[PDB]
Swiss-Prot record, chain A:
Localization in the cell: Mitochondrion intermembrane space
Function: Constitutes the soluble short form (S-OPA1) generated by cleavage by OMA1, which plays a central role in mitochondrial inner membrane fusion and cristae morphology. The transmembrane long form (L-OPA1) and the S-OPA1 form higher-order helical assemblies that coordinate the fusion of mitochondrial inner membranes. Inner membrane-anchored L-OPA1 molecules initiate membrane remodeling by recruiting soluble S-OPA1 to rapidly polymerize into a flexible cylindrical scaffold encaging the mitochondrial inner membrane.
Full-protein positions shown: 910 to 960 of 960
Coiled-coil segments on the chain, per record: 1-51
Protein name, UniProt field: Dynamin-like GTPase OPA1, short form
Species this protein is from: Homo sapiens
Organism superkingdom: Eukaryota
Length: 51, 51
């Protein structure tokens, strides 16, 4: 069983096609778009310092 | 239009001075409260001297 679990742990496809039920994926976008949010707001404040 | 130029692009280094905006900040604190307590909220240089 430990051997099987290790083999499945290394298998990325098995993780993709098993244990997919959590809602964390939705939250990953909420957190990742923070870089876009920073670049855009900083660019707008740069439009405001220039004009 | 001249007032807009002062507010926005005055095409001169003086434009968008951050001390200039602090002067208005302190003036509006004074307007909020005649009493000293709230005027003491924000920094300024107070000069006292012998008569």
């Amino acid at each position: 069983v430990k051997e099987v679990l290790e083999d499945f742990a290394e298998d990325g496809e098995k993780k993709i096609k098993l244990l997919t039920g959590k809602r964390v994926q939705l939250a990953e976008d909420l957190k990742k778009v923070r870089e876009i949010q920073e670049k855009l707001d900083a660019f707008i404040e740069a439009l405001h310092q220039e004009k | 239009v001249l007032q807009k130029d002062d507010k926005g692009i005055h095409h001169r280094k003086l434009k968008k001075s951050l001390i200039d905006m602090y002067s208005e900040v302190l003036d509006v604190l004074s307007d909020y409260d005649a009493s000293y307590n709230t005027q003491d909220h924000l920094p300024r240089v107070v000069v006292v001297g012998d008569q």
